[model samples]
Target: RAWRPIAGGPPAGPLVLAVDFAATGRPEAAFADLVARLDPGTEVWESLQPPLGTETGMVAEDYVTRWEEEVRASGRRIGAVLGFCAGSAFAGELAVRLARSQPRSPRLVVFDPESPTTSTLYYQFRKVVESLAGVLGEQAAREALAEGTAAADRIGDVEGLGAELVRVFTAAGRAACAAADLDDEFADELTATYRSFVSYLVAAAAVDHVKCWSGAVAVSSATPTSGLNPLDPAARAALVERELTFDVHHADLLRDPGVARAVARLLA
Candidate 1:
């Protein structure tokens, strides 16, 4: 596939791998937004799977491997890997392993990647709701437990909410983003809607494993904007500087130039 940069000049190696969230597939909208802000000469590789009408996590491992190999073939010198939500989980795992295997390494940038249970519950609920409606009653309680546990994950950091609510808001936010015109008001509303859903998911997912992985920084906001406020100075500073760097913003990362610049600089 052809590669294009969303912002800034081409880096030393001039290669980027952008991964999408699990259920949402590739975030074409977000990528387009990023592309608009990116400087000329930057090259970004879009990593995606067929929209199987299911979550990316539930897809078989063999399939993921094939996609990863395709990505690896594009270039040996990787400049960066950027992932959103569930895709972030996959990207993080891939980056860590890739770095370990190579003498020279690529930088990894994960945007609002979900924790374990959070990712699992989101996929599980989609499965239950889409194909296994018959088992809904029997599985509802277990699903609720998983969902509740996911909520506990984000307690103080994000907000608390039930799984059903998370699904409703997420679905709604996607619809709004896809359907609405690209105006300031619509963009602002869409950002709020998405952030709200994400915060709920993150809080639930973070319950027990706050430090599930090293080297990956989890972005958050003191005030909820859809589900993220990475610009929030307090939340940004809360993350230990030695382990990871963060630039939380009061505005939506997708819309804010500062946020885009931060991402560009991080990847650069």
Candidate 2:
């Protein structure tokens, strides 16, 4: 698998990997403060995720897999791992792996992890699509997905969500945009991304990745208000050694400076 160069300082203390999946934007913007507050010796690695086909054969589908490769090569200890939105799951697993593998036990800091991103929903919807992929065949799955385009439109109806989350759902809703009509490359990327998560979940689920962390964990959970949050912070915190709450919706975690401050304190 081809691994691309990272955008950050050289490898050093508590190397941090920021995992967020946006084909255009990287998650680094949110971590500038965290990096500044950190010792200059600290190295922050922001996953500059290239588009699916940009690399010939990329094994770095998600945060865990990507860093798993880097760690193997550098033999570096993951100082503090941070993940936001959909990335938190993979980030969580990486922390587990590192706690066991790294020379020094590293810390994991997650932001609004209780919520899943559109890709996560797409992954779920893809599950529905796949249930029928073989039995009903691709044509049937495409048809069913198209029908859900109407449901996709209803995503705008979700209330009290931040602008960022609103945008995410809107984009994901289009995934139901019916694979047949979607550009050939777009559909291929969508399929491959889901498989990436599938491999992550199947392998991670075996050990209950969250519970495997015997080291320190800082989980910033979004408080579910008016159905804004799907998972409760307190409930999610149960798995982690420690956790805190953000009254805002899950999507706001990255955009909100409060999250970074909270994480910085924990990472410190």
Candidate 3:
């Protein structure tokens, strides 16, 4: 989980360590203006770990050790930690580790937790529930999803959910098999993908960690942010809004100069 340093080189100023939370690696992402305007020489460390629904960096040890090593080599600790999408949870946890590790004091900056909708729980389903909803009606899909949620709540009851949504898994497996034409791995992909989503819910709950952090933590959320934010004003107060909006995906939050500018202004 070693991060790549973007742009020319590590500058004499602050470092913006960022993470990509959606899926796959793409280094040409994040903190353009923040560094260009704030200090062209600034160093930005980045890692991409999207919630494609897996247990990546779930333990936080690899990323912590890797980041520590990467930072030490750069001759500095992180100035600000930016977590985009699934990366938010990892970023928050990493910051906590750094705070305890005694090297430096880094602040955590999280983007809106990568989910958008009145029904965030659907994230755990990915395509399975959607396909199932098309066939079984939204109400049944809800019950199926609720079953899955309850199963996770019980610990070691993943099987209960698995059984409840047998039809969903079957349909998902069918579609994936046809698309990839890999019959052997079809079942594996379906379950692994769903399980990864469950892991995301648990990890992305890092928002809870953010609220508890006794530091100047900030969030760059989309217009609505999360439904939970409005229910609790304190959560909204914790974030410094960018005023712009993000649609279905999140890479824009990192790529958009506007986001970088907002963050730079906040840092100032």
What's the ranking of the predictions by lDDT, best on top? Answer: 3, 2, 1
Which candidate comes out best when scored by TM-score?
3
| Candidate 2 lDDT score at position 13 | 46
Ranking by TM-score: 3, 2, 1
| lDDT to native, each model | 0.47, 0.50, 0.52
The root-mean-square deviation over C-alpha atoms between each candidate and the true structure, in angstroms, is: 11.0, 9.6, 6.8
The reply for model 1, stretches above 4 Å from the true place, is: 1-12, 22-29, 51-60, 116-213, 221-251
Clashing residue pairs in candidate 3, if any? 11-41, 21-50, 22-50, 53-196, 53-197, 54-196
**Residue-level lDDT tens digits of model 3 in 144-241:** 56655554455343333433344445444555445535354645664566555544444444344543333434444444534224435655455433
lDDT of 2 at 216: 36
In model 2, the Cα lDDT at residue 76 comes to: 62
Output the better candidate (2/3) by lDDT. 3
Tens-place lDDT per residue, model 1, 1-268, is 2233344544455567776532333222365566567655667766644433222233324434555576566555666666655555555655665676567666776565444343444443444334422322334434544554555555433323333445543443344345432344554443343443343344324333223234555443223432223335664445322222234432244444655666666765
Q: Candidate 3 overall Cα lDDT vs. reference?
A: 0.52
